[PDB]
Amino acid sequence: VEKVFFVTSPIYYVNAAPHIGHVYSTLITDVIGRYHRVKGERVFALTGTDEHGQKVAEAAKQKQVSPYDFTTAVAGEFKKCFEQMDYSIDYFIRTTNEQHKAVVKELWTKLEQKGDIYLGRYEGWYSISDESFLTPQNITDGVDKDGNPCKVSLESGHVVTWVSEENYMFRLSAFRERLLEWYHANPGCIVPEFRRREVIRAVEKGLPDLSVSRARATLHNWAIPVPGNPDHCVYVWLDALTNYLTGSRLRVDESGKEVSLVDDFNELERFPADVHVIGKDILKFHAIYWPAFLLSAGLPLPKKIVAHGWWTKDRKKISKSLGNVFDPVEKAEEFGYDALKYFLLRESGFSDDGDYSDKNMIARLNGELADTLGNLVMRCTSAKINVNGEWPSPAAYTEEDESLIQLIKDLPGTADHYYLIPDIQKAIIAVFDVLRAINAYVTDMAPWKLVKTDPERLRTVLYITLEGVRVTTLLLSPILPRKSVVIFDMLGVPEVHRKGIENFEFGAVPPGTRLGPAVEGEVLFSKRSTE
């Protein structure tokens, strides 16, 4: 099937200002989308804000302003932040959007007509902060923000409350066997694998029916009314998951504004998502509830859900009051945007709860970006080594020449597989193994000596080096979107060769291609001191 590659981030609660967790999640979404665009594919990358619910409504009561003004303010902060992070997102969705509401009502009605929604009661624990139902097995003792004894989530640590309400219930219990068929039929549908094992384990134990409405007062009327029952509002999560569907059905103008909701998802060829990027904290919603709603509705299921871990700074929690902040924009201004992105994508894989420190950030920037990549780019383009300022024509290749050429020929196939898992960390490591190899080849050949001694040999060494740089840079362009453009400018790679699987091929830029012009003091990544 040939379709728009559809990649999504979670839509984030707007109870509070955007922070690193959100930036990271969206960054992951952005990178995947960026990579599929360089393969020449149509892409629709989606992010947004989850704006209804008790959590958000109460967050706005605390700051003492209307939910409409509050959600709009905070959403504005999310957009401003993401614009500043210089992503390439195709649309920003807000669940307050009127067309989103229509799609929710449409899906709800499908589930009802299917016979999968009945009137019942939920009597059990709820975490408002997580907007999540919990069994007693998943709560424990703790202290509220007074210090008085309460119950809290084992998952999250937030206060839980007992809820006893007549609610509309989705028949999730009836989807146990089909969800199990699905997980087993598509053993790559949840990444990383140990999270796939989590979901299976959980669904194996058994599934209770799920409350998909709440009484309207409980939600302070800040939700979507249940169609046909104005006393009930639709569960914030059923509403929020529907954003993926809504997004697949919106025609967007050049300004980034929704202008039309199509009746059928096929019209736009986006749905279902090829990758839902998420955090591990919201796995059940995406891997259990969502495919269950889609099965009931008769909709296609997503191809992959990839769930990453949580961040710490200096081996502690990120928190304003505890005195340990990590501001992505602040660190980008300090170290650079592409560098910070490299770090967050390099320093941790999706199975790990990684760690930012200034020390280790500077170690990677200097180590990998400046010495390994940065220096290689400057040398092979320098007037000292590349005296004619062009891509030379290679002479005959030695076996050592060819060992390196093989590594470069093999790199795209390997990096491709990693980006498709997806495992962005592994893709980066693969590209830098090839970069380390190029540097060691250069050390061996000492092109600086060859310039005097053997210009004919230099032609070969220099051409291999330029091409190795070009290919590695191409495959890193989704990680270093701005720096890759600079690198390609220095190399003098024509625009047409900066994109497309055609240009993953060794030798796509011809000898004789001229290098771009130099500047007095220019440097790709400048070293920074340690303390």
Ligand code: MET
């Ligand atoms: C459909 S994704 C919803 C995610 C939720 N709003 C959160 O911030 O965790």
